[PDB]
Design an enzyme around this catalytic site. Structure first.
Site, short mmCIF file in Angstrom:
data_model
loop_
_atom_site.label_atom_id
_atom_site.label_comp_id
_atom_site.label_asym_id
_atom_site.label_seq_id
_atom_site.Cartn_x
_atom_site.Cartn_y
_atom_site.Cartn_z
N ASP A 92 2.85 -4.78 -2.98
CA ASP A 92 2.67 -3.92 -1.81
C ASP A 92 2.33 -4.80 -0.61
O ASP A 92 1.98 -5.96 -0.71
CB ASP A 92 1.64 -2.83 -2.02
CG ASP A 92 1.92 -1.61 -1.11
OD1 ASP A 92 2.81 -1.57 -0.19
OD2 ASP A 92 1.19 -0.57 -1.24
N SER A 93 2.54 -4.25 0.57
CA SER A 93 2.54 -4.98 1.84
C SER A 93 1.15 -5.13 2.44
O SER A 93 0.92 -5.96 3.31
CB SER A 93 3.50 -4.31 2.80
OG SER A 93 3.32 -2.96 3.03
N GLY A 94 0.18 -4.37 1.96
CA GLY A 94 -1.16 -4.48 2.42
C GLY A 94 -1.62 -3.48 3.42
O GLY A 94 -2.86 -3.27 3.50
N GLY A 95 -0.77 -2.79 4.16
CA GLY A 95 -1.25 -1.76 5.07
C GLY A 95 -2.13 -0.74 4.36
O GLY A 95 -3.29 -0.57 4.73
N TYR A 96 -1.58 -0.06 3.37
CA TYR A 96 -2.25 0.98 2.59
C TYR A 96 -3.70 0.65 2.26
O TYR A 96 -4.58 1.50 2.49
CB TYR A 96 -1.51 1.26 1.27
CG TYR A 96 -1.83 2.60 0.65
CD1 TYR A 96 -1.25 3.78 1.11
CD2 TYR A 96 -2.72 2.69 -0.41
CE1 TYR A 96 -1.54 5.00 0.55
CE2 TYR A 96 -3.02 3.92 -0.99
CZ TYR A 96 -2.43 5.06 -0.50
OH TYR A 96 -2.73 6.27 -1.08
N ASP A 135 4.12 -1.30 6.56
CA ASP A 135 4.21 0.02 7.16
C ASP A 135 2.82 0.53 7.52
O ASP A 135 1.87 -0.15 7.28
CB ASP A 135 4.89 1.03 6.23
CG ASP A 135 4.07 1.26 4.96
OD1 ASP A 135 3.31 0.38 4.53
OD2 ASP A 135 4.20 2.30 4.28
N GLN A 182 8.61 7.07 5.65
CA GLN A 182 7.54 7.86 6.13
C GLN A 182 8.00 9.19 6.72
O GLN A 182 9.15 9.60 6.54
CB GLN A 182 6.72 6.97 7.09
CG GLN A 182 6.16 5.76 6.36
CD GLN A 182 5.08 6.09 5.36
OE1 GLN A 182 4.62 7.21 5.28
NE2 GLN A 182 4.61 5.11 4.62
N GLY A 209 3.88 7.70 1.77
CA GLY A 209 3.14 8.79 2.38
C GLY A 209 2.92 10.01 1.48
O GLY A 209 2.49 11.04 2.01
N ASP A 259 4.41 3.56 -9.70
CA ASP A 259 3.18 2.82 -10.01
C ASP A 259 2.01 3.75 -9.84
O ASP A 259 2.07 4.66 -9.01
CB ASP A 259 2.98 1.62 -9.08
CG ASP A 259 2.53 2.07 -7.69
OD1 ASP A 259 3.38 2.41 -6.85
OD2 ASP A 259 1.32 2.10 -7.45
N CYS A 297 1.89 8.42 -30.95
CA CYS A 297 1.91 7.16 -30.23
C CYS A 297 2.12 5.97 -31.13
O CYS A 297 1.45 5.86 -32.16
CB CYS A 297 0.58 7.00 -29.50
SG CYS A 297 0.55 5.53 -28.45
N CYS A 299 1.54 2.85 -30.25
CA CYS A 299 0.83 1.66 -29.76
C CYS A 299 -0.09 1.06 -30.80
O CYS A 299 -0.47 1.70 -31.78
CB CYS A 299 0.09 1.99 -28.47
SG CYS A 299 -1.62 2.52 -28.61
N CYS A 302 -3.40 2.96 -31.56
CA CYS A 302 -3.27 4.15 -32.40
C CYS A 302 -2.92 3.81 -33.83
O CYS A 302 -3.16 4.56 -34.77
CB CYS A 302 -2.23 5.11 -31.75
SG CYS A 302 -2.90 5.86 -30.24
N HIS A 328 -3.70 1.72 -24.80
CA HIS A 328 -3.09 2.96 -25.22
C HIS A 328 -2.45 3.66 -24.02
O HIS A 328 -1.34 4.17 -24.10
CB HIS A 328 -4.10 3.89 -25.92
CG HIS A 328 -3.51 5.28 -25.95
ND1 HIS A 328 -2.57 5.67 -26.87
CD2 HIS A 328 -3.77 6.35 -25.15
CE1 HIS A 328 -2.25 6.95 -26.60
NE2 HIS A 328 -2.98 7.36 -25.55
N1 DQU Z 1 0.71 6.77 -2.18
C1 DQU Z 1 1.13 5.44 -1.62
C2 DQU Z 1 0.73 4.28 -2.29
C3 DQU Z 1 1.04 3.04 -1.77
C4 DQU Z 1 1.64 2.95 -0.49
N2 DQU Z 1 1.86 1.73 0.10
C5 DQU Z 1 2.44 1.61 1.26
N3 DQU Z 1 2.69 0.37 1.85
N4 DQU Z 1 2.81 2.73 2.04
C6 DQU Z 1 2.54 4.01 1.53
O1 DQU Z 1 2.95 5.03 2.12
C7 DQU Z 1 1.93 4.13 0.22
C8 DQU Z 1 1.62 5.37 -0.34
ZN ZN Z 2 -1.66 4.84 -28.57
#
Ligand code: DQU
Ligand code: ZN
Ligand code: DQU
Ligand code: ZN
Lengths: 361, 361
Positions: A92-96, A135, A182, A209, A259, A297, A299, A302, A328
């Site tokens: 991820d880009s770090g804004g969030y 972003d 967005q 978003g 993710d 499961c 795994c 389990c 798990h």
């Molecule tokens: N729910 C999310 C989680 C991660 C995100 N990361 C970025 N850069 N921008 C978003 O809109 C995100 C939203």
């Molecule tokens: Zn399991």
């Protein structure tokens, strides 16, 4: 191996299954990416993350630029070598996570200076395989005016991100760049955003978003119109989603990548995912239950340990409890993704989604 | 497989190397037992504990009788099944850790009612392989009068422990019982204690009451006269010892078995054992050190991760840091024990001990 090749092998409705081939490996889609915040998927060795079926993990420009530092990681040989994961990493880009743990925002970026250029450079220093454009996320709820402002700035920053990535030859040759749509919950802004991103051109397209407080019905409503707006032949990444039922419904709506911290974070807090819905292993009712966390499961947890034992470990604060719960839950998520892929390949995903929901609920 | 067979294969001075054969497996001696306090060796799966070379682990009548409960563990199939370790388990008797976490002591036992009979029964319920007699530990320093009183009570309790163990056929047939020598630092009391224990007869003999604040020179002085007092043809167990150099010197003095929390506990706090002495991985000097924890160590941690990475994890509070540090330190201790065994077998232990000390210090 190519830098990047997304191929769709089978389709059902809006759902797709296929592969992303990259230099560090193949990603099966729809894909779930375990999150590795501080250069670790919490409580798991990378070999364990792989053994669960993960093809790719997520990292974050924020935590890592703070600790241990992006330049430091580069000096040490890159994030892959540092943490011992040799397969693709999306960053991820770090804004969030800035606006996570006295923010000053401007057209140039955020100080707390994280600009589109510095974000793409950090992701380079880390040796990211899939680089996210920098972003602005847009809080929920958002007024139309504020959503538009944020979306427009994000699109200007998407072009800056593109150009920063392309100007650095080793990054442009070896990594991929994803753009982030967005527009909050507003169809017209989602459309403008999709069109702006497609005009710039990216290797993949995230839906940004969402999962910021709106709740599943609304998320699904926005996905209904938003995902079709994105180029069909590129991956569709829903950032930060989600619960098992969120994932199934999002795949039904054309998402290819996911993710979330839920299986790791909630695992350490005692929540175990099962085909019959989540359980909280701290509940006294598990103190003498010799069954595994989930009856089907596959795994390793389990196969070997009882609910009673894991209950005891989590109640006692023991590290092994976090380890077992996390393994798990990540294995459960990967088995979900495998069942989704197989069912799409066989043309029976809609039925799988029905059956999954009947039983999970 | 026999219930219990201790065989000495090779000797050098007072040091011995050999095997204890039991129904659940063979224990190579001199042996180090990782400690598993709350039914887990902290931060390690049992398969990882085994992969480090451990043949046996330690548990404790105290923690387990409190949480999850001895009767509960029995209902669930015993400690081995509960925690997933199928090899021998030695259990401490619980005295030591009562007087751990409003004590009322009497000739009958301790309330906080843990008597010799209840301790042996708990160890039965757990399914312990090596059962420790229930004793009174004697604080250091101790006056001669107080040391004698405690030692005499422990010997009365050693006979009660013997008789409780023998009256329970399944325990007497399948487990072993060790007695515990007391007497503080006093030779005459150590001799009376050894003689009392040999008269009762046990499968092995622990040296109790050390590593309680007296320091290595004094511990070694007491071992010098105390270990020869014990039957030669049975194992000699030094409870709660110790640091690598403590272990080497104790083997030089005729000890066959060891346990201590140092490699687990100190590992989670950042201390890594190396052949060149301990290091604290939190030190800033490790932040960019790409070397493994120890340059020669064969463990999986040292094969795969750098000091720099482990430094980052421990500084960050990450569970994987505890996991890696603990695996390495337990592996280090087992490699020490293997080098001790091999050197005794080859008649070169005295030289090994010299060489070890020159470099570790
Ligand atoms: N729910 C999310 C989680 C991660 C995100 N990361 C970025 N850069 N921008 C978003 O809109 C995100 C939203
Ligand atoms: Zn399991
Ligand atoms: N240093 C030690 C550690 C454990 C012990 N346990 C028992 N039962 N008795 C002692 O003397 C101990 C001493
Ligand atoms: Zn090592």
């Amino acid at each position: 191996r190519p830098r990047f090749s997304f191929s769709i092998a089978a389709r059902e409705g809006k759902a797709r299954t296929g592969t992303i081939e990259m230099k560090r490996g193949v990603i099966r889609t729809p894909a779930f990416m375990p999150v590795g915040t501080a250069a670790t998927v919490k409580a798991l060795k990378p070999e364990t993350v792989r053994a669960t079926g993960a093809d790719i993990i997520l990292g974050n420009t924020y935590h890592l630029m703070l600790r241990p530092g992006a330049e430091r990681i580069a000096k040490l040989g890159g994030l892959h070598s540092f943490m011992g994961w040799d397969r693709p990493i999306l960053t991820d880009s770090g804004g969030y996570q800035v606006m996570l743990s006295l923010t000053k925002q401007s057209e140039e970026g955020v100080t707390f200076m994280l600009s589109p250029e510095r974000s793409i450079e950090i992701q380079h220093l880390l040796g990211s395989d899939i680089v996210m454009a920098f972003d602005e996320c847009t809080p929920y709820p958002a007024t139309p005016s504020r959503a538009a402002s944020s979306m427009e700035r994000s699109m200007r920053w998407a072009k800056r991100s593109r150009d920063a990535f392309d100007s650095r030859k080793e990054q442009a040759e070896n990594a991929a760049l994803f753009g982030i749509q967005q527009g909050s919950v507003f169809e017209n802004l989602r459309q403008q955003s999709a069109d702006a991103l497609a005009e710039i051109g990216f290797d993949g397209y995230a839906v940004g978003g969402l999962a910021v407080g709106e709740g599943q019905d609304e998320m699904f409503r926005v996905l209904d119109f938003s995902v079709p707006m994105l180029p069909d032949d590129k991956p569709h990444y829903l950032m930060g989603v989600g619960k098992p039922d969120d994932i199934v419904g999002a795949v039904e709506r054309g998402i290819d990548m996911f993710d979330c911290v839920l299986p790791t974070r909630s695992g350490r807090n005692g929540q175990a995912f099962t085909w019959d819905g989540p359980i909280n292993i701290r509940n006294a009712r598990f103190s003498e239950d010799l069954k595994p966390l989930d009856s089907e499961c596959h795994c390793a947890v389990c196969q070997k340990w009882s609910r009673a034992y894991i209950h005891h470990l989590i109640r006692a604060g023991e590290i092994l409890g976090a380890m077992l719960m996390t393994e798990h839950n990540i294995a459960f998520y990967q088995q979900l993704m495998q069942k989704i892929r197989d069912s799409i390949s066989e043309g029976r995903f809609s039925q799988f989604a029905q059956d999954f929901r009947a039983r999970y609920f």
